[PDB]
Amino acid sequence: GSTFVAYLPDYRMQEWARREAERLVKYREANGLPLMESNCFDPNKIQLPEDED
Amino acid sequence: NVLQIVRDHWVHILVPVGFVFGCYLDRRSDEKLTAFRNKSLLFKRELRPNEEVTWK
Amino acid sequence: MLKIIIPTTMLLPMTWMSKHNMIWINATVHSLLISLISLSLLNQLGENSLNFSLTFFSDSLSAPLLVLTTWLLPLMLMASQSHLSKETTTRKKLYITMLILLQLFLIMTFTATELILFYILFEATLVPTLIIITRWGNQTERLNAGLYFLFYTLAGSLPLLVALVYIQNTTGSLNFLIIHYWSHPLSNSWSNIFMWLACIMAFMVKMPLYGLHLWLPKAHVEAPIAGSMVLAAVLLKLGGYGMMRITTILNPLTNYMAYPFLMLSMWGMIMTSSICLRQTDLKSLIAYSSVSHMALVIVAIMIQTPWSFMGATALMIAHGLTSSMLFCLANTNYERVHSRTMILARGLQTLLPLMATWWLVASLTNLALPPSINLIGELFIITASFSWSNITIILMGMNMMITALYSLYMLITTQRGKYTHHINNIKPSFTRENALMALHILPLLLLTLNPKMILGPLY
Amino acid sequence: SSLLDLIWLETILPKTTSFIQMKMSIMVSNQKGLIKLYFLSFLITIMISMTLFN
Amino acid sequence: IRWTYARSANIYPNFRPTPKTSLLGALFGIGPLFFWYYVFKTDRDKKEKLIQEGKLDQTFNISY
Amino acid sequence: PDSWDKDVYPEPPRRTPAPAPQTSLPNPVTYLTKIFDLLVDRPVTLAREFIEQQHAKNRYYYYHREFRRVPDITECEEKDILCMFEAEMQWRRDYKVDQEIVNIIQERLKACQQREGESYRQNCAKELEQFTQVSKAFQDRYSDLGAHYSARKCLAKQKQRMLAERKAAKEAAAA
Amino acid sequence: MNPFASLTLTTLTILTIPIMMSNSNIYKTNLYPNYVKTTVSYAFTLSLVPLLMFMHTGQEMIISNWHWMTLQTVELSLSFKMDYFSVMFIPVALFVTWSIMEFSMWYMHSDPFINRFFKYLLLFLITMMILVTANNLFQLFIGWEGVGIMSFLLIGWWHGRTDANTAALQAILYNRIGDIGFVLSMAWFLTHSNAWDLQQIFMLNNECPNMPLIGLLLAAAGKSAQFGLHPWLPSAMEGPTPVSALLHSSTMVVAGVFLLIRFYPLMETNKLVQTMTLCLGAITTLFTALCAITQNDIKKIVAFSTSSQLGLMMVTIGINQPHLAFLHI
Amino acid sequence: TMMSGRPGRVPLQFLPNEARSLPPPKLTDPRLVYMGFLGYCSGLIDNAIRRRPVVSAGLHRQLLYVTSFVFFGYYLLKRQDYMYALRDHDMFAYVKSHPEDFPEKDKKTYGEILEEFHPVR
Amino acid sequence: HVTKDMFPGPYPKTPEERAAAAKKYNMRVEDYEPYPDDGMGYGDYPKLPDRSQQERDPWYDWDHPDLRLNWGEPIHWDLDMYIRNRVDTSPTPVSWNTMCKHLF
Numbered sequence A: 001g002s003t004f005v006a007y008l009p010d011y012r013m014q015e016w017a018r019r020e021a022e023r024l025v026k027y028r029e030a031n032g033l034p035l036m037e038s039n040c041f042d043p044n045k046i047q048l049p050e051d052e053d
Numbered sequence B: 001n002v003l004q005i006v007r008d009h010w011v012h013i014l015v016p017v018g019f020v021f022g023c024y025l026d027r028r029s030d031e032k033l034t035a036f037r038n039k040s041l042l043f044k045r046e047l048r049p050n051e052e053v054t055w056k
Numbered sequence C: 001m002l003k004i005i006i007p008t009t010m011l012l013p014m015t016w017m018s019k020h021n022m023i024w025i026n027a028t029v030h031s032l033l034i035s036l037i038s039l040s041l042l043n044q045l046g047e048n049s050l051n052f053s054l055t056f057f058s059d060s061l062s063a064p065l066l067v068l069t070t071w072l073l074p075l076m077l078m079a080s081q082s083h084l085s086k087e088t089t090t091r092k093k094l095y096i097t098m099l100i101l102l103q104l105f106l107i108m109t110f111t112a113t114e115l116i117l118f119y120i121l122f123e124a125t126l127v128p129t130l131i132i133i134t135r136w137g138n139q140t141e142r143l144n145a146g147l148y149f150l151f152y153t154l155a156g157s158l159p160l161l162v163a164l165v166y167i168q169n170t171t172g173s174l175n176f177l178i179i180h181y182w183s184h185p186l187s188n189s190w191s192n193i194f195m196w197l198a199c200i201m202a203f204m205v206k207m208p209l210y211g212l213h214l215w216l217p218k219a220h221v222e223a224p225i226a227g228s229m230v231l232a233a234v235l236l237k238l239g240g241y242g243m244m245r246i247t248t249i250l251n252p253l254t255n256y257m258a259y260p261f262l263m264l265s266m267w268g269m270i271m272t273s274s275i276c277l278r279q280t281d282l283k284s285l286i287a288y289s290s291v292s293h294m295a296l297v298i299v300a301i302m303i304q305t306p307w308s309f310m311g312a313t314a315l316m317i318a319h320g321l322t323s324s325m326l327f328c329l330a331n332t333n334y335e336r337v338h339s340r341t342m343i344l345a346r347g348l349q350t351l352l353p354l355m356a357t358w359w360l361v362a363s364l365t366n367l368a369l370p371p372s373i374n375l376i377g378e379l380f381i382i383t384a385s386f387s388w389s390n391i392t393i394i395l396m397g398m399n400m401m402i403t404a405l406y407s408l409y410m411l412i413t414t415q416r417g418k419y420t421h422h423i424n425n426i427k428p429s430f431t432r433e434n435a436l437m438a439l440h441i442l443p444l445l446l447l448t449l450n451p452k453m454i455l456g457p458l459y
Numbered sequence D: 001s002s003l004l005d006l007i008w009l010e011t012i013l014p015k016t017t018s019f020i021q022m023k024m025s026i027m028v029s030n031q032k033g034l035i036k037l038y039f040l041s042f043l044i045t046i047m048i049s050m051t052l053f054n
Numbered sequence E: 001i002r003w004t005y006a007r008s009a010n011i012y013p014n015f016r017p018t019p020k021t022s023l024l025g026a027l028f029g030i031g032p033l034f035f036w037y038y039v040f041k042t043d044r045d046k047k048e049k050l051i052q053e054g055k056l057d058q059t060f061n062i063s064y
Numbered sequence F: 001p002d003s004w005d006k007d008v009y010p011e012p013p014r015r016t017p018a019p020a021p022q023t024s025l026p027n028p029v030t031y032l033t034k035i036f037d038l039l040v041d042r043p044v045t046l047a048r049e050f051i052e053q054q055h056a057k058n059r060y061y062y063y064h065r066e067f068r069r070v071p072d073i074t075e076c077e078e079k080d081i082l083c084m085f086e087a088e089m090q091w092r093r094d095y096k097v098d099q100e101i102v103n104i105i106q107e108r109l110k111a112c113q114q115r116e117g118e119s120y121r122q123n124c125a126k127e128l129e130q131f132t133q134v135s136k137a138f139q140d141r142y143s144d145l146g147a148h149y150s151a152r153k154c155l156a157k158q159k160q161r162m163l164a165e166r167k168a169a170k171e172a173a174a175a
Numbered sequence G: 001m002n003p004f005a006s007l008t009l010t011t012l013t014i015l016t017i018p019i020m021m022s023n024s025n026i027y028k029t030n031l032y033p034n035y036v037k038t039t040v041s042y043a044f045t046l047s048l049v050p051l052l053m054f055m056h057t058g059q060e061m062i063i064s065n066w067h068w069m070t071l072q073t074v075e076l077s078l079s080f081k082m083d084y085f086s087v088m089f090i091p092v093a094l095f096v097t098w099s100i101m102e103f104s105m106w107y108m109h110s111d112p113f114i115n116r117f118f119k120y121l122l123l124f125l126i127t128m129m130i131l132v133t134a135n136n137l138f139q140l141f142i143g144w145e146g147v148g149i150m151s152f153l154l155i156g157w158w159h160g161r162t163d164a165n166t167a168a169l170q171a172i173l174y175n176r177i178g179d180i181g182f183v184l185s186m187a188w189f190l191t192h193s194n195a196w197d198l199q200q201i202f203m204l205n206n207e208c209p210n211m212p213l214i215g216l217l218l219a220a221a222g223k224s225a226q227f228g229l230h231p232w233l234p235s236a237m238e239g240p241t242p243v244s245a246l247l248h249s250s251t252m253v254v255a256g257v258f259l260l261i262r263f264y265p266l267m268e269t270n271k272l273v274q275t276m277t278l279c280l281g282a283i284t285t286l287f288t289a290l291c292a293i294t295q296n297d298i299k300k301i302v303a304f305s306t307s308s309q310l311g312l313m314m315v316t317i318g319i320n321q322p323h324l325a326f327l328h329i
Numbered sequence H: 001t002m003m004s005g006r007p008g009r010v011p012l013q014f015l016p017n018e019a020r021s022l023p024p025p026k027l028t029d030p031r032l033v034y035m036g037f038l039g040y041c042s043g044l045i046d047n048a049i050r051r052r053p054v055v056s057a058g059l060h061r062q063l064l065y066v067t068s069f070v071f072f073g074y075y076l077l078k079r080q081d082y083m084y085a086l087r088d089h090d091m092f093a094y095v096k097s098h099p100e101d102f103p104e105k106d107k108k109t110y111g112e113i114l115e116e117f118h119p120v121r
Numbered sequence I: 001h002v003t004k005d006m007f008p009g010p011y012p013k014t015p016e017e018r019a020a021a022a023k024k025y026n027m028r029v030e031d032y033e034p035y036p037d038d039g040m041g042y043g044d045y046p047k048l049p050d051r052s053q054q055e056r057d058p059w060y061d062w063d064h065p066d067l068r069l070n071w072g073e074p075i076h077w078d079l080d081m082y083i084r085n086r087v088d089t090s091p092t093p094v095s096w097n098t099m100c101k102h103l104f
Ligand SMILES: CCCCCCCCCCCCCCCCCC(=O)OC[C@H](COP(=O)([O-])OCC(O)COP(=O)([O-])OC[C@@H](COC(=O)CCCCCCCCCCCCCCCCC)OC(=O)CCCCCCCCCCCCCCCCC)OC(=O)CCCCCCCCCCCCCCCCC
Pocket: B014, B017, C009, C012, C013, C014, C016, C017, C090, C091, C094, C097, C101, C104, C127, C128, C131, C135, H040, H041, H042, H044, H045, H048, H052, H053, H054, H055
């Protein structure tokens, strides 16, 4: 059981996440983009309610 | 001696039979949740030349 | 999920159709095999969950608890094999049946896609424990202890059923997945305050909270060794699992609501750790140590931060294993001495060296020595509390110190010094007891190699 | 250990409940078996219901 | 046996509600709770105000 | 080494000085490292070559999994559960990716601090500013969500922040 | 390839082999203490090589070899720091331990459990090596607690003696009082700096606030037996003379001073904590010397001398001279 | 939902004719298996009460118990499914015939809804 | 093997029950002194002097030499606080107040 638990496949996707981050940073540095954006979602597709106060 | 140790050791077979029956029941219950098979937006895939279902 | 449930159900006919002198052998072997089967659930995803069907799902919060629940049964059988020797075959079979039913109820409780099913099984676990406590108990106060254990639980949990049916009437579903995706804020209202209280107090009573912890010393002292093991290892964690599951609906009301509980637990850990210093009983001391640890777990759950949840999960697993080991050691002493008081039998290291080594390891792991998972949960909860408020550390500091004290106190009173001259019936420790301690302790030191396996879904 | 855990925490929830339930049970169950008193109470509750619920 | 029984099981049946018992119990069971509640509430109110005005300098604080 | 990309984890050229023996005394370091080489490095190297030719005799490959882009929580109806499920899974994957990004930047910072040694305060300002920027970004997205975090809570936080920013900009323009 | 790392890890690794063989047959013979002594001597003569490499070049290295659990942004790994302090302290500690075991083969000649005594000594040495070579705060805490537990076990070597058990519990109590500040420091560093790693902490703390340094000072006072928490060091003389000579005199009790040395970049940027450290060291050395000049037990006198020397070490730390305090150690 | 007064209801009809348009429960239905298990438990308790070998006293009696339990369970499950089908049919018909009471909610995306955010601190 | 009458009871009020309780705990009537009759549940347990176990005679042949107790003798209510591993009340050459003031 300990051997089985030790060699469990990466269903948590840790190496997948590492490779994704590696490729993403490789691309962003080249483009000159400022790494990770402050906004998690693009503001153009968010419709705020106008205050008019 | 066969037909004699069975009458005393027959009980051992029950736990493994329950395990295989539970595996079969799990697959059978799985068979009833196929409404979205090969329909998820993340995994829309075109079937292989000799493939009928993506997963069983 | 039925690949685990069906063998557990088949454990009953196998036990009842077993030869009169082969019940223990058959039960232990098949329980260990079922535990091995349970190990498959540990391979969780970073995604939602392991949704097997509409009725049962798995989670990396549920999987360690399920594995521990399955692993506990062979240990309970081995511990109970000793004092049930002069007992008829029918009553031993009934005892094994009760243990199997308890495991089945716990297994169905921990998966439980729906909250009403969770409540039904959560309260179904109550009957086998009550019968085990009140039937195969030695003292005359087992009846009062059973009454306390039953009525504290039911007084806590009866409002929970009303709250759950009301929540389903309003929202429309009690399913965990639907509830998580459709969660909406609770307005700060008196009705919402009472709904929060009804949702929380049922799980608070079983931790138990410092105010409501009285039933636990009675139940632990008066129950047999298997009862004490199952109470300290698994039954206390049901409240923590329920809180972690039900807290999602509660926000944003939890912040204001949490203060009475946070203060009660932060002061009650100190109170119970200090109570441990002046105790004349091993079982009561272990029970109060359990109360302190579960008060810390309550604090972690109430803070409700990712590090809090990981620390709470790790601490629950570690405390379950450690407290089961401690109760087993105390029972090994009691079966020789028949007194169950620390100050009577002394200097046992001279007579039983390997058992003294087991005592030392158990006291060290109760003391939260690094890099054990006990201290992993300890430190995660402490860091989360410090981020919550920089003053909490002071209380935490006291707790740690006091904990160490009584732990070594329990190590020094019974193992060190001079052996009592009069006691002469201290026979060499059996292979069964040493195997029990080894099987208790090895999983902890194996898990400290892979902490993420017990850190919960927020890892 | 003694003041809070053994005495006051015990006094508040379990002991108070036991005392109250004992007193209520003693009061309710202590009927001498005289149908005179039973039917006088029946008359009282009948008239109270006629005066209260309409 | 007498020592253990008197220490554990003979306490409550010999309890009598007394001004000394009442005041000591109320103090030792309520005062610390309210003291710590006041302390933590004041600390958290100060922290919440500081984060509302934003003069807290929470740079590099990513784990909670 | 080709096992990892040099651009993702940059390193200086690592200029090293030359040995300049000012005395005729044979130093012990050179003889010690030569005997170490002879007694340790060669057997390890030959064992590695044997293992490498054993590996080449059997060869297989594994492929990194690729994921499509799914509409996020902002393109989901208020009660339509399927799209909310897909968006939540996508958001969790993106959260994991951002965590790994912060990990990479922290690794860069630690490597710089160790490598430049005594002048780490000056020669690691680039990595410090890089980490400050990425930490600022990461904190804004997920700092107060807490346990039971979700895409909806993150979207609500972003909306609150962006209304605050819009009000501040309007007030500054109309000041 | 650059034998510095291989040698500096090989010393610590070969320091563990007798613990592995403690279950073998050699543990049941009378050759076990000589086995442990030879292992320690070989470890010392093998660790002399990285010291020579440092003296020649000034070569420094970090070895983060095994990746432990990673929580969110934070990463925890088995990381060893082989700085000047580590590569300088390891040979001295190994030489002292070699001499101590050679002395103990004769001093414990009539002790029935001499193999267990040697095993206890080797475990303490391994844990102190872990403490000295730690690169992150969690590994340093692991060594911090391990040395304390081994000291508790060795002080109460004669468990039939009440006073030995009392002294061991005293040492545990005072070490937990210091542990409070240690845990406070760990919590503050993780929350504010986002890491337990030494490199990250130095980088993100240009002007260290009061609280983490006060926690570190409390831990150092607890483990170095300063005036506030001094009596456990004199009370620790209940153990066997080799235990007092190895742990409570020259290797274990410098743990707090060594910890304050480890964080000297943050110590120099704060002026109040330096003053507190200086005053604590001065009062500790005065009080301990004053107690020493009038004792009758030789072990008590020499232990008070050790405590006064620790006070002098923290005096050196408080005036912003950490390397000179290391030389004093 | 009091369906006693439903129009066109035969008073003492256990299963109406229109129930025959619904799929019958399968013979391997889990609820039928549970009813058979209940019958088997009844047989075991019957053997135990009369002081007979619990597992192997009367095979015919246990078989009769199981068979009767399965029979009654099958008919009860049929009636259950029919009654639930009636409830759903009535609810759908009432929703269809009263459009003004069940308006079609305007589909709104989360990107244009403002939900208050409560930080966890 | 202990009977019901051998367990501690309520506070003694009359001389006869005081003597009976003194007999129960195996001491003299003149040496017997219960705790003051307040709310705390001391009941009918003797109030032995608050002297520690360390200052007990170390040369007497106790049945428990480490704890310095005899078999049948009554046990102090706070025994576990005075076990020679904890606080002791042995007199010192210097008076308590002088040490406090001098130390302070
Ligand atoms: C969650 C769902 C899943 C599990 C379902 C749970 C329930 C299932 C069973 C329900 C009831 C049916 C059976 C009960 C009848 C009672 C008969 C009895 O006592 O047993 C004696 C009998 C052996 O004794 P005997 O030689 O015949 O003669 C001795 C006298 O009978 C009697 O000797 P005695 O009178 O001298 O001994 C005196 C003793 C005897 O008194 C008793 O034992 C009374 C029996 C228990 C009461 C039953 C109440 C009704 C059922 C309620 C179940 C509650 C579940 C809910 C959770 C709450 C837990 C309380 O009484 C006492 O000692 C007094 C104090 C007892 C302690 C406190 C009482 C607590 C009892 C609660 C038990 C609850 C679980 C029962 C499980 C089955 C137990 C047999 O046991 C058996 O052999 C029958 C056991 C089952 C047969 C298994 C055969 C199947 C294997 C082949 C087919 C393979 C299956 C898979 C197919 C595919 C594979 C290839």
